[PDB]
């Protein structure tokens, strides 16, 4: 490497950061930035390749890696695990940075990269993580770190994206594992003709239409149709489609159709509640919160006499996701992605084992779904 | 502000960060970066103006601000407290970034900005903080956050700089306060003719000679002499001065003299130990560590029967700083700075109230001293 100009690239990268740090207060744009939670980037490579498709030439991608290590943190060899993985990101045709922290669990490890990552205006706007698939198989303790991470991303006014494949995301290893490897390398190459359909179901979503626009204007996805689905009113159908058409003309998405539905939060048809109730069977008044669990004994000895957190106050919130799953299946069977609004419940009043339980009944048997929710701060400022 | 090219400065600042992130694995320079612990930057302005003198055109300066707020963290208005203070850094002729965190104390607040600040190779190399002046007046509890911050900067292989003025650093408000005001605005303007003398007293120091070189090659300091002081051997004096002269020729400092001393860790002259012992008078076996304090009762009821942490194992460590203080006074009375090696004690074996007690006996009545200690990783790679 015959480069004697590296000292000119240091000051070039530093005065342009001071260039970007100083601009007009009212000239602010959106510029979608994101920290991706990949772990070690040679593992989880679908979450690199998908979040390369948006945030390419238009934002920055930060590959976070919290090293869970309760004992013996080895900081001095870790710099050799910084430059190695960054060279792995550079030898592949990637435009990502890489910051690794050390903590004792996943939540407080990524707390550091929420309120301290980046410099200047090069800060992560959103947080994109993978979906915890094995949340019911064991150790329901450490679901409390994952959901209280989601609630903490919504506290810092971040946008949250959750990616879920039907199989797993991680690769750290035969023909049952052949299902893992090709279907993880499914986004960077070889995209045929199909459909990327969205489900606009929240008014203050924002980002959830910008993401399918940016991913369909790419080299691999321009033979793919954006089918906006929407639940709205019941009586007038022509003009609610018109009301969505003007907004979609603002986002210049160039859709195929805006289908209006009228059977949301009506009828779960007595099918999935038999599966949803046995899903939360070992959590019914065993919802994971040690303090609440200990606390009940000052009011009752049989705990299953109150259902206010459980079902008594959230009837149609629970019944909506079970209604939405068959609507996802009978209309988006063979799609490439599903960009779906993400259900957000309020902290404290709702349990973490119920809030997690809604997020997989919504995404039981699907293509690579994307549960997305913006911060409703401002969007469409992007492209003026 | 008629700027329609801001979108060209975003991608210009981002591809040059990818330029700097990809270089040869052997080519890397030193490039002194630092996070300064200023608090709100309109307060503590000497620690902006001094750390502007080095890390100008040659490194980055990051102005950290941990917002101690145990209750009610207000994240949504805090972005208006980000752009306001960054505009305050930009309207002054500064080249600094600014990241603000929220925590419940000072230590875990700046833990976030140690292992998660910056992107790529634009990470803070060192940590520069101010000296806690009012450590004996009240609440010896919260000295444990300051010293366990110092020990944590030395755990991440950071360099540590501690700046101490004879008066305070903070400005948040008459003629007793007129001493604060002008003497805090003493570094940016109006530097006359004088001396910036260093005390090379540690072999694996490193940075402690690079800092007085970079600050004396500036617009305000080039009528100032660098007088290297050094403690070394006793018998040969001409050739230890020669052995320092070759190293100083490598650092191209262009000094005035290399004075060799021979009365370090010999004789504190029975003067300051009367003041040092009454300094640690309410801490003698009351050294602040609640667990150790509770623990003693399994071995004794009168705690003052063991002196191993206190004086019995650290005779000449304590007597060295009291020896060094009169050497600082009889030789560096009227100087502009004192760049002095920083005493580092091992964690756990030494108390935090003793380690703090050495850091102010070394710096009792001085000019703006600078207690500096490198990470001994590599230095002099800078300027090839």
From Swiss-Prot, chains A, B:
The modification Phosphothreonine is found at residue 307. Residues 1-384 are cytoplasmic. Residues 7-20 are annotated as: Scissor helix. It is found in: Basolateral cell membrane. Belongs to the SLC12A transporter family. Homodimer; adopts a domain-swap conformation at the scissor helices connecting the transmembrane domain and C-terminal domain. Cation-chloride cotransporter which mediates the electroneutral transport of chloride, potassium and/or sodium ions across the membrane. Plays a vital role in the regulation of ionic balance and cell volume. Important for maintenance of endolymph volume in the otic vesicle, probably by regulating ion homeostasis. Also plays a role in normal development of the swim bladder. This is Solute carrier family 12 member 2. It comes from Danio rerio. The lineage of its organism: Eukaryota, Metazoa, Chordata, Craniata, Vertebrata. The gene is slc12a2. The chain holds residues 683 to 1136 of 1136 of the full protein.
């Amino acid at each position: 490497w015959g480069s004697s100009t590296q000292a000119l690239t240091y000051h070039q990268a530093l005065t342009h950061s001071l260039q970007l740090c100083g601009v007009a207060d009212h000239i602010k744009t959106f510029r979608p930035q994101c920290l991706v939670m990949t772990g070690a980037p040679n593992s989880r490579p679908a979450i690199l390749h998908l979040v390369h498709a948006f945030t390419k030439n238009v934002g920055l991608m930060l590959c976070g890696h919290v090293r869970i290590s309760s004992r013996r943190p080895n900081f001095k060899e870790l710099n050799s695990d910084m430059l190695r993985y960054q060279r792995w990101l550079l030898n592949n045709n990637s435009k990502a940075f890489y910051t690794c922290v050390v903590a004792e669990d996943l939540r407080q490890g990524t707390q550091y990269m929420l309120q301290a990552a980046g410099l200047g205006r090069l800060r992560p706007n959103t947080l994109v993580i993978g979906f915890k698939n094995d949340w019911r198989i064991g150790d329901i303790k450490e679901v409390e770190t994952y959901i209280n991470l989601i609630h903490d991303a919504f506290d810092f006014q971040y946008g949250v994206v959750i990616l879920r494949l039907r199989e797993g995301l991680d690769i750290s290893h035969l023909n049952v594992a052949d299902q893992r490897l090709l279907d993880s390398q499914q986004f960077q190459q070889k995209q045929g003709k199909g459909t990327v359909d969205v489900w606009w179901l929240f008014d203050d979503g924002g980002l959830t239409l910008l993401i399918p626009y940016l991913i369909a204007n790419k080299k691999k996805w321009k033979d793919c149709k954006i089918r906006v689905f929407i639940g709205g009113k019941i009586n007038r159908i022509d003009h609610d489609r018109r009301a969505m058409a003007t907004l979609l003309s603002k986002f210049r998405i160039d859709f195929s159709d805006i289908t209006v539905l009228g059977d949301i939060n009506t009828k779960p048809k007595s099918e999935g509640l038999t599966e949803f109730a046995e899903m939360i069977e070992p959590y019914k008044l065993r919802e994971d919160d040690m303090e609440q669990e200990a606390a009940e004994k000052l009011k009752s000895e049989e705990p299953w006499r109150i259902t206010a957190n459980e079902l008594e106050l959230y009837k149609a919130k629970g019944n909506r996701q079970i209604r939405l799953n068959e609507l996802l299946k009978e209309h988006s069977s063979t799609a490439n992605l599903i960009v779906m609004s993400m259900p957000l419940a309020r902290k404290g009043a709702v349990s973490s084992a119920l809030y997690m339980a809604w997020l997989d009944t919504l995404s039981k048997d699907l293509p690579p779904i994307l549960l997305v929710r913006g911060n409703h701060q401002s969007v469409l400022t992007f492209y003026s």
